């Protein structure tokens, strides 16, 4: 499902080496390390991101995300 679509409101590197993003008012985390620079780039350049996951509750994990310039 499409959990959240919008700009990244903040990102956060976590003590357990996971990475959190806030998108459309909801927070999600990923353990995939290559998503860290991909998400920070999206945040900096103002990409619209679509977080995709089986479970979309705030505070849930994800490992699928779409990146759009617009």
């Amino acid at each position: 499902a499409d959990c959240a679509k919008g700009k990244i409101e903040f990102s956060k590197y976590n003590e357990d080496d996971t990475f959190t993003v806030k998108v459309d008012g909801k927070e999600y985390w990923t353990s995939r390390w290559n998503l860290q620079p991909l998400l920070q780039s999206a945040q900096l350049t103002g990409m619209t991101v679509t977080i995709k996951s089986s479970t979309c509750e705030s505070g849930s994990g994800f490992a699928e995300v779409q990146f759009n310039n617009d």
């Binding site: 390390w33 290559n34 900096l44």
Partner: protein
Amino acid sequence: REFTIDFSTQQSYVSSLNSIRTEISTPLEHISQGTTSVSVINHTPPGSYFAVDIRGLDVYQARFDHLRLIIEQNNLYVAGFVNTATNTFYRFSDFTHISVPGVTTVSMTTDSSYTTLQRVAALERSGMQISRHSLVSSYLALMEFSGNTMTRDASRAVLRFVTVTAEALRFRQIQREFRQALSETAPVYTMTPGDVDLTLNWGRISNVLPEYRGEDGVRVGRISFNNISAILGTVAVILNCHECQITGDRPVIKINNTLWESNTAAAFLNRKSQFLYTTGK
């Protein structure tokens, strides 16, 4: 089209440069104060040039008056030089498309690039000294020059003259720093690494500045402008981007109220996970 750059005083020099700029370019709507602007070169066909007569090397004297530079108008590149006494146009190899009527054209083997000129001249631009004295020496070298291949002294002469004409036309920073050498105290202008960096980034700057709409800063590779006075104090004339494009099709990205050249941002945002990078040898 014929212009004079008069090196007699700081006043005559700056006046000369401003007169050229007004004729060949149009101020940007959003980077202009009074009659001091960043201006975009007016569209002209390829092959169009203007002539620059060098004057006032000896202050206010009709001496050393036989040198003319040929400048391609669209890009402000120096295509070569004319000895008006011998009526000879010495043309760089990369400018065979520039045709000057009523002169003997000598097509040179040497190209106009800084890479080539610095090599032949055995002179690096970073730390290059320019004074009134060395411009007189440069003039005399160019007047003595003959043949189809640039010599060391002719190349040193061209490096100095291109800096104080074409590069100064583009960059108010170079105009400001060099002009001190024209004063009665006759100090030496030393070209800084920062001056050199500007000249190497002219195309990239040209692609970005038309997008400026009062952002808190501008970042183009190694170049940074923190405010409008920094922009105006540095840049006077830019290419018409309407060598503007390197790759891609996005001039700029606004990041935290700073206008970035998109390519610069892309070039530090293309790294993978650091742990994975270093371990994956």
